[PDB]
Design a protein around this ligand. Sequence first.
Ligand SMILES: Nc1ncnc2c1ncn2[C@@H]1O[C@H](COP(=O)(O)OP(=O)(O)OP(O)(O)=S)[C@@H](O)[C@H]1O
Ligand SMILES: Nc1ncnc2c1ncn2[C@@H]1O[C@H](COP(=O)(O)OP(=O)(O)O)[C@@H](O)[C@H]1O
Ligand SMILES: Nc1ncnc2c1ncn2[C@@H]1O[C@H](COP(=O)(O)OP(=O)(O)O)[C@@H](O)[C@H]1O
Ligand SMILES: [Mg+2]
Ligand SMILES: [Mg+2]
Ligand SMILES: [Mg+2]
Ligand SMILES: [Mg+2]
Lengths: 312, 309, 313, 312, 312, 312, 48
Amino acid sequence: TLRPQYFKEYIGQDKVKDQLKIFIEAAKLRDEALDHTLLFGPPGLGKTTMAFVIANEMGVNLKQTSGPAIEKAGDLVAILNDLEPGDILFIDEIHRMPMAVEEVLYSAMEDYYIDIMIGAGETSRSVHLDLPPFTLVGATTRAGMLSNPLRARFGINGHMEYYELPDLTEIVERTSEIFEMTITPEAALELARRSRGTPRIANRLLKRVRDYAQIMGDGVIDDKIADQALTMLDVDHEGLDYVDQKILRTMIEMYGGGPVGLGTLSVNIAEERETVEDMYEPYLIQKGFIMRTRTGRVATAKAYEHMGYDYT
Amino acid sequence: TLRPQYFKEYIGQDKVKDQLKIFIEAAKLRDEALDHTLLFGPPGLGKTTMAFVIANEMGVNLKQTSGPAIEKAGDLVAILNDLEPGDILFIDEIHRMPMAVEEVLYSAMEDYYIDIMITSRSVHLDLPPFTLVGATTRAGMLSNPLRARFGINGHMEYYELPDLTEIVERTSEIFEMTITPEAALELARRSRGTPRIANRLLKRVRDYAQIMGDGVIDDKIADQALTMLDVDHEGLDYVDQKILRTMIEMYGGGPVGLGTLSVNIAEERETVEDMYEPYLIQKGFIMRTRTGRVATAKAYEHMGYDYTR
Amino acid sequence: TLRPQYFKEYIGQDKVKDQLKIFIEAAKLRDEALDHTLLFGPPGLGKTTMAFVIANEMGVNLKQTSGPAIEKAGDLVAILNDLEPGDILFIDEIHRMPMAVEEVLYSAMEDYYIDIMIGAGETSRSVHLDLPPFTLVGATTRAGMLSNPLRARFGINGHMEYYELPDLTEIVERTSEIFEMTITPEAALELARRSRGTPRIANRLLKRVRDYAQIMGDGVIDDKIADQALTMLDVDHEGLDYVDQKILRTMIEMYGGGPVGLGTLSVNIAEERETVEDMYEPYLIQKGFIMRTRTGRVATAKAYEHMGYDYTR
Amino acid sequence: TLRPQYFKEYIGQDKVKDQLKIFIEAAKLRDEALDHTLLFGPPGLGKTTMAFVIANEMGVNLKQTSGPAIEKAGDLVAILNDLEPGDILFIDEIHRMPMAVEEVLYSAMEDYYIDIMIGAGETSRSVHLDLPPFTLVGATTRAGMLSNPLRARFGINGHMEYYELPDLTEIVERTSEIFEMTITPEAALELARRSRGTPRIANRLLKRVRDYAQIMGDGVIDDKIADQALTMLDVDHEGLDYVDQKILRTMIEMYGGGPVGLGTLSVNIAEERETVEDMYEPYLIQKGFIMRTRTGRVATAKAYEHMGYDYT
Amino acid sequence: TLRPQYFKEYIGQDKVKDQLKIFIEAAKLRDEALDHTLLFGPPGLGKTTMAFVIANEMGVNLKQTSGPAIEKAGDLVAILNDLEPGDILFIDEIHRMPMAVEEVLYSAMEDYYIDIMIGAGETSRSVHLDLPPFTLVGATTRAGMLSNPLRARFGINGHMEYYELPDLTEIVERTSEIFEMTITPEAALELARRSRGTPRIANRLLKRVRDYAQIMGDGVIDDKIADQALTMLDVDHEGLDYVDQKILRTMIEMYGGGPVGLGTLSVNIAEERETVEDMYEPYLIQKGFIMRTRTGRVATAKAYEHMGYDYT
Amino acid sequence: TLRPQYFKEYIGQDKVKDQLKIFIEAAKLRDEALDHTLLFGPPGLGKTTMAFVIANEMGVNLKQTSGPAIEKAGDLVAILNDLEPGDILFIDEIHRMPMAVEEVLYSAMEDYYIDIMIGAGETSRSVHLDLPPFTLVGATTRAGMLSNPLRARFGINGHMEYYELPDLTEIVERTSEIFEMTITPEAALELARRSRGTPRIANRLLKRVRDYAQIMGDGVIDDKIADQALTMLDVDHEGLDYVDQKILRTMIEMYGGGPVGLGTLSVNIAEERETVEDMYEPYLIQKGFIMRTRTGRVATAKAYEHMGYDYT
Amino acid sequence: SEDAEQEAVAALVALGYKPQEASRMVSKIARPDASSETLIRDALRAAL
DNA sequence: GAACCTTCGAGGAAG
DNA sequence: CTTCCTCGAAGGTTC
Ligand SMILES: Nc1ncnc2c1ncn2[C@@H]1O[C@H](COP(=O)(O)OP(=O)(O)OP(O)(O)=S)[C@@H](O)[C@H]1O
Ligand SMILES: Nc1ncnc2c1ncn2[C@@H]1O[C@H](COP(=O)(O)OP(=O)(O)O)[C@@H](O)[C@H]1O
Ligand SMILES: Nc1ncnc2c1ncn2[C@@H]1O[C@H](COP(=O)(O)OP(=O)(O)O)[C@@H](O)[C@H]1O
Ligand SMILES: [Mg+2]
Ligand SMILES: [Mg+2]
Ligand SMILES: [Mg+2]
Ligand SMILES: [Mg+2]
């Protein structure tokens, strides 16, 4: 299967993985439910994949839903009240729940009970509905969008980190065995170093290289085919796309490296201001090719030697 | 039990706790009901816990509901009809009651009667003496005429290190865990002044001691557990340390804008502003300025860099 | 009870109180009802109580309701049928009445009769309804939102105003005698100074002081006990709460008086944006301690000399 | 019809056509659905046209809708229930969809399932909907408005480029045949040079010249007729408007080439400050007539020779 | 009723009244409806009264409504459909009606017809309704807030203005006689001076002064009584009201005479800026109590000496 | 009615008429509709009338609506569903249309189809509506205020300008012929001089002058009578309005001649910014009363001598 | 008297009451002989 | 003093 | 009714 199922198969995330192991083992010695867990961090690092692994290691059934599908308290109350002892409730994109619904979970998470209105007219009554022990697991990209009293109730916090070349190369090799393809250890490293640190991007590059190898090649991925395929996609050995290279080149040849404003640079590449700041500039800054200053953007020494100019 | 039941158990909150004792004792001496009390303040300081103490000190049975559940006047009218003389009604998250429900609550508090229309028919009720207790985090969201009817206002405050040290020891005995006095102190420094955070750290440290040790907490095991959780001696998280380091090493302490800093740490702008900055500004590690924010002298000494004016 | 019942006891509001007496007597010197009256003022000044006193001085029954309770014209016309000649109709929150009813009320006030039209329009006929004379008394917190045609029908206007120390002190003296406690005039004046000019607040402070004076003392409110009570409660001698002092102190010490944004101030004191904007900031503006500007809040010279800090432009 | 129907008719976009061909061929050999593809770039370059070409080459029927037509989750769920195995869904102007609905696609694109709430309301439960294999095609002008988790799920990215004079000349000739008009090869090149590298503009000018040639002429677009019609429309031989000529002339006559600030120039031309910067200045920079600098903007040598003044 | 019914009875407004006479009589000679008329100015000057006089001079039925009273096109269509040839429609506060209503008024006023769509989905229809000759009379307090395309449809304009002591003394005397009240030429001159140049206030004061004379006097309005009665009503010797006195006193005590903005002032005293700007500031400016400056309003020396504050 | 109906009757706008004649005639040889046309320029110059003339020349019906009237997509669909083959749809103030509504026209204009969700609940479904051929006509004050993808779809652009004194004189002579009246050439020229080169204003003043000449004169319009009638109105001896006098007075007295921004000015005269930007500022500039600078508008010495101040 | 009955029902509807409830309310009045004014007046008095 | 650029704060109208 | 976001301000640098 494409998604790992146990901690043996889950590569990387040593900090989060090592922590979860200790908490799972201690919970089993006490024969009690696991504490509530919140998983957050950048897109595509394995948040959803981890939520399933947690259920398998605990050996219990996993019930799944999503924030967008819950629209009113009546819906949530119907998901609850159907839970059995030790069940795990997983909610993806939990930040989309209406704030009027989040405030129902406040009592459920701390005391395992909820308030309900029942009856009609003079017969109406309010009673406590008592829930069995359970573990709520949430995954989100926008943790700052949750209410302050809700974040305070999660007992375990997992913040995901980017991967490194050794771990990504192993992921590429594993995926290359789900498909029925041979890949030379040198070719795998060449794709891993261009995947910007993210497993989803590594899998995407492999799929595209495969289509080439079986149309313009003999059906095997080797050092010769990888170089040709990556040249067609036009991805630099640092992962810089065609437009990424054009940005750095223009800063060096017309503005002498800057400083230059975002408006001035956008017009010279025919790109609109809102795409440059949200798609291309973020990775260039995080990798040290560009520096932001009060005067404008400036190219670093690292950018000069990568493009081949002289740092005069 | 994790929730204290009497004032002799409720640690801290000397200001609010001292006032409540005077008013409760006076109400008993006159055989009158307690005045309407509103509790408000930051999350996790004891607002819900205090409401249950007040009921036991008065010697009454507490009726409990919540704002999100009460959706229409018919709901509230049915609830009020179950009150007996001297009963206490506690409404949690009172800021969520619809405006229509709040209007009905005005006259119930001032004149102890309800006269409302609701196949429709009239209802008239004349209520016995009762005490309303409300708890909220967003007291600014209540209507101005409603706030004017509460008689006792209790504003909660953060705890000091000697108070939290005692709270940790109390919880340790419930789990029958053995903990040394200096180990309990090392958790207090990191608990940010909040009881819920102090209990959370203890639960995590217990799990470590039962798997990587002999199930006993000492000044040595605590250091290992806190190193795995990666919580600084000032209570800063891994991301909090990364923010300060970036500001000092890339911008000379600032000024720097929020957007620039967020992109440099690969975080969503809203997460830095709402989840990490509040504690840094309150402790005095960062200042906000017309042109950006800057790291203060305290940040340099804590992180270990040479300050230059 | 804590509500005065006649002009004999309604303390303060002398300007409005004096005018009403002359008009009410002139109405008695004729077989006529009083003109329609509208009361203006901030919340908690005694608007409701004044309506009841008007009815007693007239010696006529009073009907009580609020604008939101009148949802259709039939309700108003039905209520009008329950009135006897000369009865007073008191409608609170008159600014919240629905538009569809407002346009019909004009005829009742000026004409005391109503006409209703029926039929498709090609063939149509009316019905005429004659009403007993009455006087409408409206109470509202906001005058400007009342439409000009409605405003023209009200023949008497009465501004309520904040009570001054010489009058608010007497309310404390009076209330202290409904309970069983003796209170020294000096102590009563210390409570009045901190009551922000609102009777509801002065009553609330006195109740708390009474609790202290009978638990931490001999059951007498003397000036010494009053100081100790006003020390457990953190109410400043200018009426500032604990948090009001913390706001002003923060602005002066860390921002040099500002300008500073609402969001930056909120995170410094650890409070919610809504709470600072609606609970504390409104009273600080009336006293003139701060001002709102295009660039944020700013502290005034009045705040510097009150907190005791040197000033610099 | 004006719109091409197959890759053999789609002139230009050599880089985009080459990639799509390889991926479409590999998909057919495996007999599988094509990966999700996102088309983006400047207005009028041929995005909506290419979406139909992909469907014709794959040999499937196309289901069509638009971003603004979808307003709530109940709309999208209804559409997805109609997809058959191998169907292609095309969503134009995808950046307009609301965030509440955009987050529903996350599961459908990765795992082909949706979570829905069902039951009368007294009794209700969450259940999976399982979708057959399908290909989503999206077209957008403002890729930066899409959330990061959505862009990460598209497997093929197509960035459109402006057309060169040789290619744009062929489009003018092909269109003339559809209008049953006769055009001299020298006239086709005159229009192509004025079409700002954009196929829509080239077609608009041709349509106007055609109407003119049959009202005051003999029904043939000769080299002499073309000059008279283009003079009526006031289109310079570089594609400049009269407003653009006014800008360039002012800088040479009143400032000797600059530098000059945008605020000062706007007043001297009686044009709106922001209109000049957003509507006219972008093309003048891209063509090399004006150059921005830290002290202001300057007219280049190309602007002198085009106006006939003496460069110094 | 107190309001006059004919131009012979309408005192003052010589400018507006003289123009309307010419246009009203000329329309009779041609036997046709009067052009649309817009009346604007401070409240209480006689805008409503004037509309009734025009209707009586024309000999036509008058229909009345208000801006806030109309919420949807169907409401206005009913009113318009009930018109009879020559009827006058009077709309008060025409500046407050919704944008969706104004859509229909353009077509009606310009060509006397409307086009209302009806039906939905498979049902869709539009009714072309012809309207008989009619005249619209509009009234507003704010002229600059009226929609520009609407303001162009009005053919006659009437700018109302404040009354002088000779006219107000005649009005005060007239009104007293209707009540059969006896007032000497001396007391009537006091009320006119102290009634802010406005007939509505003058009538409002007279009813209150009557009550005082019926108790604190012998039913005869003496000059000595009028002064004591007006002072008891808190009406200044210059006619300034409670709000007027509070404005100037707040400027002198809290702002050293200003300059201060309209919003800031209206927030300190619990008053609406629309009220202060409509009823109070215009009067205070014409009489020199307030002056306008680039920084805001400033109190003149006259205000200082009247209020009894030593000038700086 | 006064509205012209054929190009022979439409005086002026020679440039626009000359171009439209060619395109309208060419579109009749072929049996097809005219391309989408865009008209822009100051208000009241006669672009609505131009839409009627085009429809009369084409021999089809004209439907009329406006930008602000189309609040939501379901409104526009109903309008489109009611067009007959070859009809003309005129949308006034198209720039003020909601953004999400504009995005629907993109398909209707370019391909004559729209994709719409119909029904409710389980009946929710997508239907591909096919539209008959039609011609859209848009009118707007600002060209640089439409979006780039909308502006790029209009095939014909028309710019309109103020009429010269010889043209307005003939328009007055025509209008004074529909009314059975007699006017001497001196009065016609004198009246046109006041009408700001705008036919709408000319017709309004002519009607008022006619009423005066019928009641206060011998029924004949002469230069002596025209001065008297115009002096009784607020029209200045060179066409300045009372609003213009208000503007110039404020600039000279309250700001010291300027420079001043229109944002602060608009709030001091209590006028909607759009009115001064569109209706007043353009005329005051095009006649030398106001001069523009980097910082804002400034009053010229010509203004000082007109208002009676000293240009020290 | 049927005219007065219909008039009272329509007049009550002209006051904003629903046609069904207005018919019942007026139908609930016993005396038919009383004039339409009394019928509407009685219905409104009973509805309080 | 002229011209660019970054950052913040309070409105206000589009879900 | 609430979130979002864009209009207008002013602080700082270079030439
Ligand atoms: N003149 C007065 N003398 C004594 N007590 C007074 C006086 N005016 C008000 N009070 C007290 O104030 C209390 C509240 O009065 P209210 O009539 O509610 O004022 P209010 O204007 O109605 O406030 P609202 O209606 O809630 S905005 C009363 O119960 C009295 O005890
Ligand atoms: N010229 C006048 N002659 C007689 N009475 C007048 C005159 N102007 C105003 N009034 C009186 O004052 C009041 C004016 O009200 P109204 O005409 O509605 O003013 P507005 O319409 O401007 O609010 C009426 O009572 C009216 O009789
Ligand atoms: N060239 C012209 N000849 C005769 N009358 C004209 C001419 N231009 C405009 N008009 C008249 O002046 C008025 C212009 O109104 P309209 O065409 O609606 O202007 P807009 O559409 O810009 O508001 C109409 O009464 C119209 O008949
Ligand atoms: Mg996921
Ligand atoms: Mg709680
Ligand atoms: Mg009250
Ligand atoms: Mg397209």
